[PDB]
Design a protein around this ligand. Sequence first.
Ligand SMILES: Nc1ncnc2c1ncn2[C@@H]1O[C@H](COP(=O)(O)OP(=O)(O)OP(O)(O)=S)[C@@H](O)[C@H]1O
Ligand SMILES: Nc1ncnc2c1ncn2[C@@H]1O[C@H](COP(=O)(O)OP(=O)(O)OP(O)(O)=S)[C@@H](O)[C@H]1O
Ligand SMILES: Nc1ncnc2c1ncn2[C@@H]1O[C@H](COP(=O)(O)OP(=O)(O)OP(O)(O)=S)[C@@H](O)[C@H]1O
Ligand SMILES: [Mg+2]
Ligand SMILES: [Mg+2]
Ligand SMILES: [Mg+2]
Lengths: 160, 423, 316, 286, 237
Amino acid sequence: SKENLPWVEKYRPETLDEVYGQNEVITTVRKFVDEGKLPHLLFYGPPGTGKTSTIVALAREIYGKNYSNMVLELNASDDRGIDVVRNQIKDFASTRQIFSKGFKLIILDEADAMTNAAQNALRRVIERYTKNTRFCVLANYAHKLTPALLSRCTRFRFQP
Amino acid sequence: EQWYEKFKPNCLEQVAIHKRKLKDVQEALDAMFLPNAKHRILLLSGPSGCSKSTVIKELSKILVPKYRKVTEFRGMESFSEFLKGARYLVMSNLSLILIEDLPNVFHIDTRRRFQQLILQWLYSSEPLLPPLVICITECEIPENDNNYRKFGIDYTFSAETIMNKEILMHPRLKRIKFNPINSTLLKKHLKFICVQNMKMLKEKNKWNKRQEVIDYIAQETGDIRSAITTLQFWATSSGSLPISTRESTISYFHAIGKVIHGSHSTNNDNEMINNLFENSNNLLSKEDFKLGILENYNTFNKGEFSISDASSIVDCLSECDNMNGLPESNEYGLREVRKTFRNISKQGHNHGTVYFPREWKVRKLQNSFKVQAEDWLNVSLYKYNAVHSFRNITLEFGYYAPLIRKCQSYKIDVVDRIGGPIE
Amino acid sequence: SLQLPWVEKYRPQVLSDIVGNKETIDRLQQIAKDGNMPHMIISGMPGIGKTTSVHCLAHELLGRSYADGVLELNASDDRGIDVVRQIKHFAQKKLHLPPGKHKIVILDEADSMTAGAQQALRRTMELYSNSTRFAFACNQSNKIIEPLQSRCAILRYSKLSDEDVLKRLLQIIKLEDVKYTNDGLEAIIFTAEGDMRQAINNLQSTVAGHGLVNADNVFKIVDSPHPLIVKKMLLASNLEDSIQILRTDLWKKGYSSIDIVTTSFRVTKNLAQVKESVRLEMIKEIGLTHMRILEGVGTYLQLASMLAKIHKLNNK
Amino acid sequence: NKFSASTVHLEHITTALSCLTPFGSKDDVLIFIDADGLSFVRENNHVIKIQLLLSRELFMSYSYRNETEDHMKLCVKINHILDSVSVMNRNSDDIVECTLSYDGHGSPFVLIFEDSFISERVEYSTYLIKTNGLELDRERISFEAIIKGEALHSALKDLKEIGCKECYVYAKTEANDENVFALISKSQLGFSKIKLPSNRSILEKLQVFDGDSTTVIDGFAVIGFFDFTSFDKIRKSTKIASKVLFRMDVHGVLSVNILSQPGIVIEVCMLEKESAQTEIELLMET
Amino acid sequence: SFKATITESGKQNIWFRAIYVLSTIQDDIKITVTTNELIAWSMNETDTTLCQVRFQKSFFEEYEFKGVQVIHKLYSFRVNGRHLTTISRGIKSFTIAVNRLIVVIEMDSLIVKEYCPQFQPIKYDPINYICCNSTLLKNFLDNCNVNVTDEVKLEINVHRLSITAFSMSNTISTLEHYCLFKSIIFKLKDFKNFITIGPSWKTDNISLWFCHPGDPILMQMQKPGVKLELVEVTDSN
DNA sequence: GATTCGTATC
DNA sequence: ACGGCGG
Ligand SMILES: Nc1ncnc2c1ncn2[C@@H]1O[C@H](COP(=O)(O)OP(=O)(O)OP(O)(O)=S)[C@@H](O)[C@H]1O
Ligand SMILES: Nc1ncnc2c1ncn2[C@@H]1O[C@H](COP(=O)(O)OP(=O)(O)OP(O)(O)=S)[C@@H](O)[C@H]1O
Ligand SMILES: Nc1ncnc2c1ncn2[C@@H]1O[C@H](COP(=O)(O)OP(=O)(O)OP(O)(O)=S)[C@@H](O)[C@H]1O
Ligand SMILES: [Mg+2]
Ligand SMILES: [Mg+2]
Ligand SMILES: [Mg+2]
C-alpha cells in the first residue's frame, strides 16, 4: 500500500504539523485558516521545499472529506491554455460551493510554465470571483509570471 | 459633440493637407473620373489621421456631381458580394467607392481573397468602372500574445503586406503616400479651433495661454485628430493636467539613423536606447535590424572613419549573433554601435545615405543556384548513373562540369556554371 | 469563511477614495458631473487604480442605468472579432439617459486584444460615437493600435507615491482597528514599491500572522524587493561584498539563478552613475550568463563568475 | 469472470452511450458494477454529473459472482468505446448478442459482439480512478416539478437556437392552481422566456417548499441561475424521455431525473452560478 | 399601439420565408407600420436591391392601431433580421406588438414563449410586361448555385422566353402576358429568394416590369393578403 | 534620422 | 427522398 512507495512520496506530509523548516509561512497560513479568510496565495522557492505539501495539507484542514469537490488542482501535466482558463477555471469559479467549507480553492501548481495569455486572462477571474474562490499559485521561477499576476497574489517565500 | 467631430472641415481650405499633395490627389482623382481612365485604383497609404479620407470626402463632394456620395464598405466573401454590387455604380451612379473598411486582412484566407479580388477588379474587362479608392493606415501592429506565426501582417499593417507586389505595381493602380501633418498646418488649425472657443477659453482664463499648448501639441504629434482631442481635453480641464498625446512608432530607417547618429531630442544614449526598446521592440527584435546596422554603419561620414571602430562594431555584431535571440544581445549590440559612433562623431561630417540589406537578394540567388544544381543531378542520374552530393556540385562540378559539358559540346546537359557565374 | 480579503473589502466605490494621481482623479470627477466623457485610454503600472477609477467613473456617470449602460469586457471573456461584431448590438441599443450621459464600454485589459478585434473596434467607435463611449484600460499603451489611440484621450497614471499609500493604509487601519508603529508602516510602503494592492496584501498578512505592524514582523514574512538587492550587489566596490550579497541575500534565500540574471539585466538597463561602455559590457556579461543558465548550467559558480567579470570590467 | 452480462437489445446500450456523449466526448468514464445493475457516471469540470443505470432486468444473464466487494469500480476512456462501437454498428441490422465482462482489478473491460458467425472481442484498458459530492440534499428541496419529455426537449432546442449564453428557471405556485414554470434565457435576442403550461399533461406536478421539502407555500418563487453550457447536457437525454423530474435545493443543485420506456434511468446533477433577479421578477409579473 | 396576430399555418410560413429573405438582404430588417397594412422591406450595401413585402390588415386576425412620421400617421423602425428570423422560425397564435419590440408565441401545446427584441425608430423611405409562371422559373433557379453563377440574362422574344444564368440556360415557350409594348442582366442571390417567398403559403405568377438596361426592374407577386415587391438595378452600359 | 532638391515667406 | 440549415 504505502510500504511499496518511494521515500520521497511515502513521507509526504499530510498535516501542516509535519511540514518543517518553513515556520513563518506555516504560522501565517494557520492563522489565516483559523480566522476564516484566505487571500490569494503565491508560494515561491527552490524545488523540493514543501510548497505542494503545504498547500495540500492546508486545503485538507480547510475542507476535509470534500477536498475533492472544493479544490481544483491544475498543474503542468494538464493543458492550461487560454481556452482552459476561460472555460474550466471560469466555470469552477462561477458555480456555487454547495455552501461546503465557505469558498472554493484553485491550486495552480507549476504556474511558471503557463503561457502569458492564460495568466493575463486569469487576472479578471482571480479578482471577480474572489468572493467565492481563492487561487493559489506555486512556482519556482518568478520571472515567468506576469507582474499583474504577482500584484494580486500574496507572496510567501519558501526558504531552503 | 467632440471637437474632432464638431469642427470638421466644411470645405477643402479647412482641410489640413499640404498644397502639393492636395494638387496631386486632386489631379489624380479627376483623372480617375474620365470615361477610359488609365488608373482604376487610388491606393492612399500613410499614418493615422493624416486627412487621408477627409480630403477624399471633400473632393468627392465636388467631383461626383460634375461627371455624374462615397459608398463606404462595411467589413468570407461578404466583401465579394459588396464589390459584386460596387461595379453598377456607373454613370448616373458614379459614386467614388472608398474602402477605408478593410475586410479582415489578419486572416490568411480572406487576405488572399481580398488581394485576388482586387486583382480581378484591376483586370476587369468591363468598359466602364467606378473610381476605386482604398485607404490603408500604416500602423505597426503591437506584439501579440506569444503569436508564433510572426508573419508579414503580424509586424506592420501596411499596404505592401496587405496587397501583393503585382497589385501595388499594376499600371492601372496609382499610389499616393501621405505624410504626417506638418506643424505649420497643425498650428494654423489648432488656432482656428481656439478662435472658435475663445469664449470658454476666456472665461476659463486659458485663452491668454493658448499658443503655448497650440505649439507643444503641434510639435508632439502629426495626427490632426489626436491634436484636436488633446486640445479639447486640455481646454475643458481645470487644473494643470499633463498634456499627453498619442504615441507614434519610428520607422526602420529612422531606428537605424537613431542608432548610428543619435537623436537631438535626447543627448543621453542610455535613455534613448531604453525608450527605443520599450516602445519599439517589434523591430529591434528582428534580425533584419542587425543586418541593416551591419549594412549601414559605413554610411557614417560616408565611410571615412577609423578601421578599428569598424572592426569593433562588426566583432560585437558577430559576438551578439551567437548569443541566441536573447534580449541582452540587441541591447549590447546597439549600445556598442552607439558608443563607437559617439566617440568618433564631430562637426564637419557629411553623413551618407542608408540602405536596406541585400540578404534577401542573396537568398533568392541561393534558391536559383539550388534549382540549377538539381537539374544537373537528375540528368546525371538518368543519363550517366551518377550521384553527386550538392556540396561537390557547389565546390567542384558547378564550375568544372559545365566547362567540360560545354567544351566537349564545342568539340539536356548543363553548359553554363551551375547557378550563374562568379563576379 | 465569511470575510472578504482587504484588497476587495476596501476597494473604493467613489472617485473621492482613489488616492494618487490627484489631477487625473479630479479630472475624472469633473467628467463624472459635467458628463460628455470622451474616449479614454488609461495606462500605468499594476495597483494604481486604473480599473477602480474606470468602474467608479461609470458608476458615478451612468448611475441607475449602470446595468444597461456598462458593457464590461476583459481578458477572461472572449473578445475576438466575432465579439466585436456583443459590442455592436450594445452600441446600437437606444437607452434614455440623462442629458450629457452616454453608454460606456469598459474594455479592461485592452492590451491583450487581437488586432482584428481592434480594427473592428475602430468601425464601432466611428459609427456609434454619439451614443456610446469606450474606456480602454491597459498596462502598456503601445499595445493598442495607433488608429484607436487617435480617437481617444490618453490618460497616463503615474506610480503611487509614499504619501498616497500611507494615507490609504491609515484609512484601512482605522477601519480595521489594527495596531501599528511608524517603522512598520514605513517598511510596508518600502516593500510595496508603489503598489497599493501589494501594500494592502502585506498589511493583511502581517496583521494575520502577528497582529502588530512593526519592522521586524513585517520583514520576517515580507522580503525586501529583490531588484534592490540585485542593484546593491551589482554596485559593490570589491568582489568580496558582491559575492557575499549574491550568496546570503539571493542564493540562501531561495531565489533562482535565472531570476537573478533577469533582474540583473533590468537593473543594468536602469542603472545610473555608470558609463555607457561599462553598462554595455555588463549587459554582455549578463547575456552570456543568461545563455549559460538557459543551456542547463544553473550553478552558483556561473553567477560568481559573472560578478567577477563585472568587477573586472568596472575596476579598469 | 467476476461480472458477465448478455443482451440482444443493443439499441438500449447504444442510447445509453449517446446519452453520455454530451458530457464531453474524449475523457474518462466511471462504470459501477453492482448486483442491482450497470451504471455509467460522468463528471465535467466538477460542476455537472450524469449517472445512467442499466438494470439487471435489461439483461437475460447477469451473474456478478464477485463476493469480496459489494460493488466494482472501473475507469475506461469513452473515445475508445465510441470509436469501436461506431464501426461495430456498421452491420447493426444483424442479430447481435452483446456480452459485457470484467474479471476484476487489473483486467480489461470485454465487449464481445457475436453474430452466430463472427465473434468480435474487444478488451478496453482500465485506468486508475481519480463523484457523489454533486448530489442534492433530499431534505432541502425548494421546488419539485414533473415535466413531459417532449415539451422540455422542444424548449431546450429553442434555447439552443436562440443561443442562450445564460439561462434562468422559475418555480412559483400561487394560491390557486397557478403553477408557473419558465425557462428564461439571456441571449442575443435579449431577455427571452419559455413558459411551461399549467395544464396537467405537460406540467404534471409543481410543488414549491421552504427549503425543507415538507411545507408547501404559495406566492414565493425559487430562482435558479444556470450556465446553459451545462443545461444543454440534458437535451440529448430528454430526447428519449417520457417524463422529466426537476428538483432543486437551497444549496444551488438541480437534479434532473429522466425515465425512459425498463428503458434506462438518467440522473443529472447541475450546480448553480454565483449570480438580474429583479429583472426576472418584473418580466414574469408582466 | 400596434397589436397583430397570425393564427394559421401557411400564413406563418409565408411570414417566416419573407422575414428570412429580408434578413438575408440586410442584417437589420426594416418594418414600417400603416393603419391598413404592414410593410416590411430591406436594402443593400451598394443600394442596388429593394425587396418590400406588405401584409394587409385582412392578413391578421386583429390589426388594432393606436419614429412617428406623417405623410396618415406611420411608425417606422429597425430590428435585427437574424434575431427576429429565429422568433418566427406547431404555432397556434403568433402575436406581434409594440423601447424593444414585443412578440408573443402560443404553441398548440399551450407553451407561451416571450421575446423582447430591441428596435430603433427611423424614417420611411418609399416598359414591357411579363407574367411568366413562378414554378417554371423556380425549378431552373433552384438548380443554380449562387457561388458559381451570379448574373441572369432575361432575353424576351415574341416567339419564346429564354433565361440564362451566366452558362447554364433554360427556355420557356411563349408565358401569358408577354406584352412588349430585349436583354436585361441582374443579380441572382436575391431573385431565387424572392421567387421562393411566394410558394410557402400553399392554397403563383411573377410580374417583370423593365424598361431599359440602365433602368431598374420590378418584380411583383400576388397573395390573398400579402403583397410582394422587388426592385433591382441592371447594368447601365 | 540623414541628404538633396524645391518652395514660400519674411 | 432532396434542399435548406486550411494556412
Ligand atoms: N518541509 C518538509 N517537511 C517534510 N517533508 C518535506 C518537506 N518539504 C518537502 N518534503 C518532502 O519532499 C517531497 C517533495 O516536496 P513537494 O512539496 O511535494 O514539492 P515542492 O516542495 O513543491 O517542490 P516543487 O516546486 O513542487 S519541484 C514531499 O513529498 C515530501 O516527502
Ligand atoms: N482641419 C481639419 N482637417 C482635417 N480633418 C479635420 C480637421 N479638423 C478636424 N478634423 C477631423 O479629423 C479627423 C481626421 O480623420 P482622417 O485622417 O480622415 O481619418 P484617418 O486618416 O483614417 O485616421 P485613422 O487612421 O482612421 S484613426 C476627421 O474626423 C476630421 O473630421
Ligand atoms: N488609488 C487607489 N487608492 C486606493 N486603493 C487603491 C488605489 N488603486 C488601487 N487600489 C487598491 O487596489 C485594489 C484594486 O486594484 P486595481 O486598482 O484594480 O489595480 P489596477 O490599477 O487595475 O492594476 P491592474 O491593471 O489590474 S494589474 C484594491 O484593493 C484597491 O483598494
Ligand atoms: Mg510541486
Ligand atoms: Mg478616416
Ligand atoms: Mg485592471
